Design a protein around this ligand. Structure first.
Ligand code: U10
Ligand code: I7Y
Ligand code: HEC
Ligand code: HEC
Ligand code: HEC
Ligand code: HEC
Ligand code: HEM
Ligand code: HEM
Ligand code: HEM
Ligand code: FES
Lengths: 16, 144, 232, 181, 403, 135, 204, 16
């Protein structure tokens, strides 16, 4: 619950 | 500060006492316009401002060519923006070059003299500086 | 004119969302250097590992201050004004001022960063929450009709009775991730976290003060009796 | 403000290098899709006036008027930048640099002026970065570091920022930005 | 123990001092609310000394770390926020208690013969307190700290000839800087605390030499019983010690309420702009003094001339020194002074409060007009005292205190 | 002045204290070298207080700046080196004078009755001095 | 170890100037003198401010700045195994005789990390940075002929000037201290005469 | 005199 609340805004799409 | 390398219509920024000092190589047309700006300045003679006793009361500089002004707007001490352009669209048509404060819209002429009815109550400070040589000045020691 | 916000410092979830917003959208330019990640995690109820993984982006330790890489002089040169440290900004400006300021950015082409602020006119801050709020402009929108404080709501639906006004902050539709209520909640959580950061001892202060005042009332009873008696 | 509808027609010549919608297929050509209209217009004016040197665009903007440039910038800003993929071996370092900067060296995080998601600030002119080609981003960071690109203004925002990035840092952060969204 | 006290008394006048100063020291039995404030001033001085010693354990008197050290106290030091709020609230409460103390002196003519030296030592204490609070307010190194210090020390630049040199010498630098911070810290932490403790000792010694006034202004020493104890006199210990204990508990209730619930006190005990770090290049939109300096500020702001404004502000405090010779009333207490004295005391209190209220805000037309009027009235309360204390008709002072 | 002192004496124990402690206070006439050190200890205490106050105006009690601030006193502060040397040599002289004072007490039994409290307060002073000098 | 005595003259402006030159060129690479300012060194050594800035300030610092260096203590401690201590007060920490014997006691020792050891400071982490001037010194210490710019006397003079500058840096107030103390003691003798006469008069 | 006494050790050859 806290982890979802604290998710960083920037999402990076990575190879594999 | 070595000042002989400032081409006409451009200024450099020295750092003195932690404050930014604009050193402007004032060309002719600007010095011709300044005598025509007395109708819009609250302190055209710098009576209540701060400046040395050896600078001209009107040009507020030791010599008209060079303008040494501590770039600290009197109203809240913000650094004015240098606008040497003749009639900028957002400065109005009466502009003849000078300093436009961006925080609260305070205006000064190219001699540092504040415009009338602006947040800045006094003119821009003139620091105590001297001419060691024709191309170099010292900001911090009074002229002899 | 500021907008009131009811900030609940006992809301851990709201403070957590505010901390996430601060760490992502604010710590790019603003430090919270008078405040440690460890204390923020302890007070917000965030596990230390979770705080490390989710809110500490600068490689600092858990016990380190919320410092950022942007130096005040560099940022003053870049923006025209140094982004102040935001640890105490809630105390400096108040929570209502912050709530109104972070929601008062509107497009202003005349400005260096293309935006201005109703609360902080000619502010040097770029509108960094534009992606969330969306494009906000000084335009015409519906505002509740008020006549000498005579505020009209709809008796049946309970919604305001509105008339058009052309000097209002309006968000351009379909321009931001969050609607007005969602952005309001985001800004509320952020300002709640800032309020906590400015005064992290508030809740403990209230508890300790309650106990101190109870003790002082007890001691006052005894001292008053020892005075009135012995004054006979 | 420009007209995206007319910019689409006016942007056909550009689509040869940047792609029809502004999502260039080749890494060395930047993606113009979804880029801030203010930033796009500033870059096009700089290239017209020589403030920014793009040899591949020699004389392409000379015949386009200010309104044509505004229309093209609006058309490209009306698109969506496709998101690339970050190198797994570099994504950690690039993410750390982008989100945190360097406290010790005093390098800002990129998440302030460019959003945490890399969308930039369109009104402020801070360019969209997320999804931009890693090769192009690395080239721009190198050019800022060496002063090759100086159209970031007198404040030298990006020149100063890139002065603090090593080649490995530039590569890692470019790889991270390529996949950022 | 009896044997231990006998051993001590042969070698130290412990019992003699105790029976000379607290027990067997007969104060008037009609002390009221207004006589709680000397002991409360002592309590606040002890609080300031203790909490300041503890703040000094963590404070850094450098321009680079003063503000950061204050935040370190507020957040990192265990209960450090409590100590800091005790100190700030205690400075504000020191001035509250001292102003009520001085107003008691005004109300009951307690500055008059034989208590002229008591009043003069009290005024020296007030001068030391003002210097101490001013130098302390610079220590946080916030915006208000820095800029208030800048203006207050630029005042020393108003002296016609040596003003600028004196201001530079006081600052230790060409502007307010970390040198001024460290210097004011040293003065605030040792020198002025020592001076204040010595002045308080002298003040209490002079009082005990001449004895306390009372609300009725009755010289209780005139009427004594067969044992030599004044008829209207009771031993300070235990009766007034327990009374002062009750007063101390009430004061502590208010003090702790402020500390733990409203430490800022609406931005007056801890000013909001002072929570921003000092910026030599950006000054606050409106810079104002701490509330307890606001009245004199208003006076200084009421005078259009700078040097005359500084002179008037200084005289506003200096006239209280000569107050004992300005009062020509045949009676001490305002209860038995003529209508003119009561009216002028009301006018002085109202003018002082209005000056403080309008010196706490940015200049305004009504504010400026009322500040000038209140400056005139504040100075007239003293200047006209030698006259209206004689023109008025005073009531006969009772032989025995009322109650 | 006579009138001024008459005014003060009715309001302060000025003359009475002066005549109880310094004048009309009859000390033995055979004080020798060893009885200089109480007054000298008083002087050294005053010197320590004054020089320490002036050092505190330039000292930075932080691990990062304490040594640097001491050197700043020694080099940048006008006559700061004088004040620092007065302070350090004054600590050393304080202990010299206090040790000679205590040894006078040992020699002449000044701790014996009725001066046991004098000696105990002196030892409390010595403990405070040890702690002060160490810190 | 046994030290060599050196007579340090703090009134020799030329010797102190040569020592300052040697310190700026050969010693400020690793050692700071961060507790003294270039301006004060120039004033006390009789060096004009422009000359001081041109000849002794290599870091780009102002005349009024502390004689700081780029080599941070942590990096130097990692690199050399020991941090090069700030040398502003080294003449007080070690004494001029110790410095004089130490800077002349470097000899070649292949077993050591930097190929040198020191008689005064065994197993010291300093590289022999004055080897170009002294030459190759080997073990009794002997300098290999035709290996350094200076002979034994010239290198001794160089080290003496450097140690004199270090002694001044540790105690920049020594000359003013003696000058002021002379007058203070004269006044105190003058005041002692009067105090003694007053005491003698009263104790009749 | 002083200028010669303070000459920097490092000498650099420069084109022309
Ligand atoms: C907006 O803005 C504004 C506000 O703000 C926001 C305001 O608030 C206000 C309103 C302001 C107020 C009302 C606040 C007022 C506050 C104040 C009053 C603050 C003022 C504080 C200062 C500026 C400090 C100034 C201090 C000064 C000038 C005093 C300086 C004193 C010294 C430096 C002391 C000198 C040291 C000495 C003498 C050394 C000791 C000498 C010795 C000889 C020691 C002894 C030595 C020996 C014994 C050796 C010699 C031996 C002898 C004698 C031989 C014989 C031996 C024997 C011992 C007998 C205004 C107007 C304002 O607009
Ligand atoms: C314009 O409207 C005026 C309204 C009155 C006011 C505030 C003005 C100028 C000087 C003020 C006086 C200076 C003297 O200062 C004081 C103190 C200093 C003394 C030397 C002289 O008297 C005043 C009694 C005197 C004084 C404080 C009383 C009030 C004067 C402005
Ligand atoms: C979360 C998105 C943020 C919040 C909440 C705040 N900031 Fe900023 N900011 C920036 C600058 C250059 C300034 C100075 C502008 C000026 O002085 O004119 C500011 C200012 C503020 C303030 C005002 C504080 C005050 O006392 O007046 C507040 C309350 C504030 N900011 C909150 C720049 C930036 C920035 C760089 C792109 C970022 C990412 C943020 N600010 C983010 C936030
Ligand atoms: C290939 C012949 C090109 C064509 C046709 C157009 N552009 Fe382009 N452009 C090209 C390159 C190789 C680059 C990168 C330069 C570098 O420094 O690496 C660019 C760059 C731009 C930019 C800047 C993008 C940014 O900063 O994010 C803009 C705004 C741009 N180009 C606009 C543009 C327009 C409007 C064109 C049609 C008129 C156009 N480009 C064509 C190569 C080529
Ligand atoms: C880096 C190549 C150095 C230069 C150039 C100079 N010194 Fe140095 N010094 C260096 C180190 C790594 C150390 C520490 C050695 C250890 O084992 O601790 C030192 C030490 C000294 C000392 C000793 C001081 C003390 O122990 O208190 C002195 C007196 C000293 N160095 C002097 C000195 C002089 C005069 C130099 C120029 C001729 C000089 N050093 C250059 C590293 C380096
Ligand atoms: C503050 C403002 C910053 C921050 C902290 C960073 N950048 Fe960015 N940047 C900024 C501006 C004003 C501009 C526009 C420059 C111009 O007008 O010519 C840019 C641009 C870039 C670019 C070029 C984008 C493109 O060519 O399409 C890149 C690649 C870039 N910036 C990267 C970058 C990185 C990696 C940062 C963190 C290390 C970073 N920026 C921070 C302004 C700012
Ligand atoms: C009459 C006695 C005193 C008064 C009226 C007084 C007043 C003040 C005030 C108003 C402040 C500003 C606090 C703030 O706004 O943050 C302050 C700060 C400070 N004071 Fe004093 N003080 C007194 C005695 C002392 C003493 C005796 C010491 C130490 C021995 C001390 C140490 C400090 C310190 C370290 C600070 C800085 C930390 C802080 O600001 O809280 N004070 N003082
Ligand atoms: C700031 C610290 C002060 C302390 C600790 C202090 C302490 C005391 C105490 C304990 C008393 C006796 C009890 C009482 O009358 O309340 C007293 C009396 C008195 N004080 Fe204060 N005082 C202080 C400041 C002042 C000031 C600023 C003034 C006036 C300018 C003053 C003037 C007087 C007078 C005139 C009396 C005796 C009046 C009477 O007997 O009614 N004191 N003081
Ligand atoms: C009996 C009284 C005192 C004694 C015996 C004493 C002793 C000492 C000693 C031995 C040192 C070390 C000095 C050094 O080695 O350089 C020292 C340092 C210091 N003292 Fe005290 N001291 C006394 C009172 C005070 C007071 C009252 C203050 C401040 C009001 C003060 C302020 C300082 C400061 C700032 C330092 C550090 C600066 C320095 O080392 O010179 N001292 N003290
Ligand atoms: S900063 Fe210039 S008018 Fe306010």
């Amino acid at each position: 619950a806290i982890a979802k609340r604290l998710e960083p805004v920037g999402k990076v799409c990575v190879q594999g | 500060v070595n000042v002989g390398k400032i081409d006409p219509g451009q200024q450099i920024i020295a750092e003195w006492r932690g404050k930014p000092v604009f050193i402007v190589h004032r060309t002719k047309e600007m010095l011709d316009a300044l005598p025509s700006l007395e109708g819009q300045l609250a302190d055209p003679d710098s009576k209540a401002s701060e400046q040395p006793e050896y600078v001209d009361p009107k040009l507020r500089s030791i010599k008209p060519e060079l303008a040494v002004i501590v770039g600290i707007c009197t109203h809240l001490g913000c650094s004015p923006t240098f606008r040497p352009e003749v009639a900028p669209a957002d400065l109005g048509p009466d502009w003849k070059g000078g300093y436009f404060c961006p925080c609260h819209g305070s205006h000064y002429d190219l001699a540092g003299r504040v415009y009338k009815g602006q947040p800045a109550p006094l003119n821009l400070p003139i620091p105590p500086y001297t001419f060691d040589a024709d191309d170099v000045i010292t900001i911090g020691v009074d002229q002899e | 004119q500021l907008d009131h916000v009811d900030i609940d410092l006992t809301d851990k979830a709201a403070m957590q969302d505010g901390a996430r917003t601060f760490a992502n959208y604010c710590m790019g330019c603003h430090s919270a250097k008078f405040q440690r990640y460890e204390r923020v995690a302890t007070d917000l109820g965030i596990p230390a590992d979770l705080m490390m993984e989710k809110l500490v982006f600068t490689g600092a330790k858990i016990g380190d201050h919320m410092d950022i890489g942007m130096k005040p002089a560099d940022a003053k040169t870049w923006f025209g004004a140094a982004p102040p440290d935001l640890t105490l900004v809630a105390r400096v400006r108040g929570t209502d001022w912050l709530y109104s300021y972070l929601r008062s950015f509107y497009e202003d082409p005349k400005r260096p960063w293309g935006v201005n602020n109703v609360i902080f006119p000619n502010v040097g801050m770029p509108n960094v929450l534009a992606p969330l709020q969306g494009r906000q402009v000084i335009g015409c929108k519906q505002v509740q009709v008020v006549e000498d404080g005579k505020k009209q709501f709809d008796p049946l639906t309970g919604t305001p009775l509105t008339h058009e006004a052309c000097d209002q902050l309006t968000v351009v539709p379909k321009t931001g991730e969050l609607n007005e209520a969602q952005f309001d909640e985001k800004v509320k959580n952020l300002v709640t976290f800032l309020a906590y950061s400015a005064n992290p001892n508030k809740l403990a202060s209230e508890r300790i003060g309650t106990y101190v005042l109870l003790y002082l009332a007890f001691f006052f009873v005894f001292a008053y009796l020892l005075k009135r008696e012995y004054w006979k | 403000a420009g007209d995206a509808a007319a910019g689409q027609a006016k942007a056909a010549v550009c689509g040869a290098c940047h792609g029809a919608d502004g999502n260039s297929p080749a890494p060395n050509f930047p993606k113009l899709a979804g880029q801030g209209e203010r930033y796009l217009l500033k870059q096009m004016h700089d290239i017209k006036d020589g403030k920014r040197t793009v040899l591949e665009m020699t004389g392409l903007l000379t015949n386009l008027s200010d309104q044509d440039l505004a229309d093209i910038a609006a058309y490209f800003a009306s698109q969506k930048m496709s998101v690339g993929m970050a190198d797994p071996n570099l994504v950690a370092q690039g993410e750390a640099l982008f989100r945190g900067g360097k406290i010790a060296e005093g390098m800002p995080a990129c998440t302030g002026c460019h959003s945490p998601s890399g969308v930039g600030i369109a009104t402020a002119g801070f360019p969209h970065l997320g999804g931009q080609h890693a090769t192009y981003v690395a080239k721009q960071l190198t050019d800022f570091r060496e002063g090759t690109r100086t159209n970031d203004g007198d404040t030298k925002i990006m020149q100063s920022i890139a002065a603090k990035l090593s080649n490995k840092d530039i590569a890692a952060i470019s790889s991270y930005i390529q996949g950022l969204h | 123990m009896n044997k231990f006290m006998a051993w001590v008394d042969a070698r130290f006048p412990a019992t003699k001092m105790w029976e000379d100063h607290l027990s067997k020291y007969y104060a008037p039995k009609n002390f009221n609310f207004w006589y709680f404030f000397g002991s409360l001033a002592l309590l606040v001085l002890v609080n300031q000394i203790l909490t300041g010693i503890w703040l000094t354990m963590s404070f850094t008197p450098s321009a680079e770390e003063a503000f950061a050290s204050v935040e370190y106290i507020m957040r990192d030091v265990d209960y450090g926020w409590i100590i800091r709020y005790m100190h700030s609230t205690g400075a504000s409460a020191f001035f509250i208690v001292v102003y009520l103390h001085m107003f008691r002196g005004l109300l009951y003519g307690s500055y008059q013969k034989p208590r002229e030296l008591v009043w003069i030592f009290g005024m020296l204490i007030y001068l030391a307190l003002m210097a101490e609070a001013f130098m302390g307010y610079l220590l946080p190194w916030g915006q208000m700290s820095y800029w208030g210090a800048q203006v207050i020390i630029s005042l020393f630049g108003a002296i016609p000839v040596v003003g600028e040199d004196l201001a530079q010498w006081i600052r230790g630098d060409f502007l307010i800087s970390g040198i001024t911070l460290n210097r004011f810290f040293a003065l605030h932490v040792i020198a002025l605390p020592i001076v204040l403790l010595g002045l308080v000792v002298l003040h209490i010694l002079a009082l005990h030499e001449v004895g306390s006034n009372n609300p009725d202004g009755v010289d209780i020493k005139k009427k004594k019983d067969e044992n030599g104890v004044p008829l209207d006199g009771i031993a300070f210990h235990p009766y007034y010690t327990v009374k002062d204990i009750v007063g101390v508990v009430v004061f502590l209730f208010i003090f702790c309420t402020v500390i733990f619930f409203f430490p800022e006190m609406g931005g007056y005990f801890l000013e909001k702009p002072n929570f921003e770090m000092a910026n030599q290049f950006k000054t606050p939109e409106h810079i104002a003094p701490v509330w307890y300096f606001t009245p004199f500020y208003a006076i200084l702001r009421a005078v259009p001339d700078k040097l005359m404004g500084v002179v008037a502000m200084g005289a506003a405090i200096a006239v209280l020194f000569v107050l004992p010779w300005l009062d020509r009333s045949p009676v001490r207490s305002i209860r038995y002074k003529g209508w003119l004295s009561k009216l002028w005391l009301v006018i002085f209190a109202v003018s002082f409060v209005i000056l403080g209220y309008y010196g706490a805000q940015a200049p305004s037309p009504l504010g400026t007009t009322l500040s000038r009027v209140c400056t005139v009235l504040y100075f007239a309360f003293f200047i006209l005292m030698p006259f209206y204390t004689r023109m008025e008709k005073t009531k006969p002072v009772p032989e025995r205190v009322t109650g």
